[PDB]
Structure formats: C-alpha cells, structure tokens
Amino acid sequence: AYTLQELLTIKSDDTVGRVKVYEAIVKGENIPEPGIPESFKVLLKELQS
Amino acid sequence: VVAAFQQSGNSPMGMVLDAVPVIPPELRPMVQLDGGRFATSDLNDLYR
Amino acid sequence: GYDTPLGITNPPIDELLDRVSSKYALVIYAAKRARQINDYYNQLGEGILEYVGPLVEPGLQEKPLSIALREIHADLLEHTEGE
C-alpha cells in the first residue's frame, strides 16, 4: 500500500511533497507523509464548475 | 424520484441556475502561437 | 538447521512469522521501530532519550530497518494490535 501511495502521490504530482521529501533526504530527517495529489485537487476544482 | 428529493434534504430549486461558475485560467490554458494567435481550448470561445 | 544465509535475507522470514501474527502486520511492526531508531539518531546530538536507541548492538553503519528486523528476531519488542 505505502509503495503505491508514494508512486502515485509523492513522486509524480505533489509539488510541496517533492520539495519536502527531497529536503528530508538531503538531511537526516524522516520522509514526511505524502499529501493530496494535484490530480485530485484539479478534479475537484473542475467538477465544482 | 420525489422520495429521493425529500431524503436529500435539498430543494429542487438547484435545477434553475442564476450564476454559472468559470474554471481557473490554467485549466483552460491560453496559448500564443508564432503570430500570437489564440488557438487554445475553445472554453474561452464558449465563455466569450 | 541450515547454512547461514548472507545478504538482506538474514534473519529469515519464517522465523519472524513465528513472532508476528501475520506478514502484513510485521512490515509496519518493523517500520515504526525503524522510524523510532532514525528519530533517536537524529536527536543523538542533544535531546531527550525517550526513543531508546538500538537494543542489539548495531554493526558498522547499518540501515535502521536492518537493526529493527534483527532485534525483532530477538523478541525484544511489544506492540498492540489495531487500535
């Protein structure tokens, strides 16, 4: 499950997710949990239309 | 149909609109060609 | 009762299943401990020792998850089930 979550959210769409995970890897901090993928938010803001 | 309406807790008045919304500008990206022509999604055309 | 393996397959899988209820629980049961170990390493410079460091003495620059798996095989951790 978590692998699929990462592949779909944290390495393809989530901008802040990418920035935060890259910074955490650069440092010794644990990878923060992914966020809301851009695809879902776009789908929302489009279906609300 | 009527029982669905009643249970929804809403009113049928949602079937007559007075204010259509418009999606953000990026969703309908605007494109400039070599001559700057407007050839992006026609969503702009319909809103026009 | 078999030749000692080498690589990431040590300790074996069947031994661990004897402790954990199911293989699906074990992955989280070890990942959380690895997270705690990494947090302890992060605070090693200064802080509170609430996340007690590794129980089994680590090797030479071993990944925290390997430490967690190698200490779980030693039956040194206790956990609660779902909620």
Swiss-Prot record, chain A:
It comes from the Bacteria. The RNAP catalytic core consists of 2 alpha, 1 beta, 1 beta' and 1 omega subunit. When a sigma factor is associated with the core the holoenzyme is formed, which can initiate transcription. Interacts with CarD, TRCF (Mfd) and RbpA. DNA-dependent RNA polymerase catalyzes the transcription of DNA into RNA using the four ribonucleoside triphosphates as substrates. Belongs to the RNA polymerase beta chain family. This is DNA-directed RNA polymerase subunit beta. It comes from Mycobacterium tuberculosis (strain ATCC 25618 / H37Rv). The gene is rpoB.
UniProtKB/Swiss-Prot annotation, chain B:
Disulfide bonds: none annotated. Induction: 6-fold repressed by starvation. The RNAP catalytic core consists of 2 alpha, 1 beta, 1 beta' and 1 omega subunit. When a sigma factor is associated with the core the holoenzyme is formed, which can initiate transcription. Belongs to the RNA polymerase beta' chain family. DNA-dependent RNA polymerase catalyzes the transcription of DNA into RNA using the four ribonucleoside triphosphates as substrates. This is DNA-directed RNA polymerase subunit beta'.
UniProtKB/Swiss-Prot annotation, chain C:
It catalyses: RNA(n) + a ribonucleoside 5'-triphosphate = RNA(n+1) + diphosphate. It comes from the Bacteria. GO terms for molecular function: bacterial-type RNA polymerase core enzyme binding; DNA binding; DNA-directed RNA polymerase activity. GO terms for biological process: DNA-templated transcription initiation. Its EC number is 2.7.7.6. Belongs to the RNA polymerase subunit omega family. This is DNA-directed RNA polymerase subunit omega. The chain holds residues 28 to 110 of 110 of the full protein.
